[PDB]
Amino acid sequence: RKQVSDGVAHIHASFNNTIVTITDRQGNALGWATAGGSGFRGSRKSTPFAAQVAAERCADAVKEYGIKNLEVMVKGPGPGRESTIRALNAAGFRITNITDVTPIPHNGCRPPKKR
RNA sequence: CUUGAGUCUCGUAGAGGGGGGUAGAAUUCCAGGUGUAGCGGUGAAAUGCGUAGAGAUCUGGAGGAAUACCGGUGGCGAAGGCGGCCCCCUGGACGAAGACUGACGCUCAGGUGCGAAAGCGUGGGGAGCAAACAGGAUUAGAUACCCUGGUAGUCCACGCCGUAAACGAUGUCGACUUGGAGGUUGUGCCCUUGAGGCGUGGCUUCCGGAGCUAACGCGUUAAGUCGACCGCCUGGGGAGUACGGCCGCAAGGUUAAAACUCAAAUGAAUUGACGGGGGCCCGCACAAGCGGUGGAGCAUGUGGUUUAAUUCGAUGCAACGCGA
């Protein structure tokens, strides 16, 4: 519909999934593609190649507006989830900055018990 | 009488305590938009939540709990314990100069108080987390593991209980006894002539001499040498149990045996066994080449089948052209 060319991307890299969304400087999301929606199940939805193809299928699906520059932040201790941003940048999008914004509390609440 | 003990002056540090405020980050929910087909989870799936529309990104609100970084066997406190910031009140410790009272000191059976967590009662609160419980799969049993929700409870106020590896496994107080390396905190002097050095105080960490000890180990903060007082022990199991007493609303707490059974139970240290590890070395063990067996026939041995007998002996690496 329009042209932005200055956006910001958010990747929720869960320990067993991967979500990616892009918005434009204000919070209004445009497109999203889950790595769990392209035939991937089991542990395949947790591999770096899954992140690669998710980055590809989210980059091609947002070309209706033609974004070039991008802001990007890392969230969640997703194993091997820098391949997705490397691929997004390799797809012709000049990334500006990277930063890990995983939420850290101040001993606010009690985390669930582990095995 | 002033050395022990205590009071006053001047200052220091400290998550010391009680009460009330307030702050930001995170999680939960709600309202308002973006926005589309899954979210979630395991090792795979499933239960659960999704098309009047979810999971992800912005604005605001509502409530509860806790204060990442400084953060460190750092600090304080009799112990339990204490961690955002500020304010009101308060306790304790220590250092410097003096001044003052005059033995006013230590310990303490009964007695009283404080005392982690869990637990109970009344009245509120209840975000996240989380004993039982329900649901899902695996199943001639599932009632163990994992996964999604969740009640007590974790919070507040007033009442209870008074137990723990409440550990420094080391009761309190005083004196004498060679050292080294740190942390923390005052203060005196000399020339503070950059955070100078020297001695002098307090609390705290590690090594180690004599000595003590069964050894491990302790070692000026003694488990060394003594003094004053209190508590506790007389083989293991039965058993911190029964019967009573006291306390408690209840669960229970405290004091606390005997019958019976065994010949030990136990602490330290030694010497080896441990089973995969890691790293360090050799060998036709491999890498590189050549010649071979497993394809055909023959010889030969063994095992099986058979026969009246197929004589006996060898059972992988160490046996099968072995005793022969």
Q: Coil, strand, or helix at residue A29?
A: strand
Q: What are phi and psi of A47, to 5 degrees?
A: -95, 155
Tokens representing A32? 């999203």
Chain B positions under 7 Å from a protein CB? 24-27, 33-45, 54-59, 64-68, 127-130, 145-147
Q: Which residues touch strand B (CB under 7 A)?
A: A 10, 12, 14-17, 19, 21, 23, 26-32, 34-37, 41-43, 45-46, 75, 103-113, 115
CA at A92, C1' at B48: how many angstroms apart? Answer: 41
| Dihedral (Cα; A67, A94, A96, A19), 10-degree rounding | 60
Resolution (A): 3.6
Separation of alpha carbons A55 and A96, rounded Å: 17
Three-state secondary structure along A35-95?
CCCCCCCCCHHHCHHHHHHHHHHHHHHHCCCCCCEEEEEEECCCCCCCHHHHHHHHCCCCE
> What residues form DSSP beta bridges with A23?
A8, A29
Question: Could you tell me the strand order of the sheet in which A69-75 lies?
Answer: A29-32, A19-23, A6-12, A69-75, A95-100
Separation of alpha carbons A98 and A44, rounded Å: 26
Would you kindly state where each structural domain of chain A is located, as residue ranges? 1-115
Please give the method by which this entry was determined: cryo-EM
Q: Coil, strand, or helix at residue A22?
A: strand
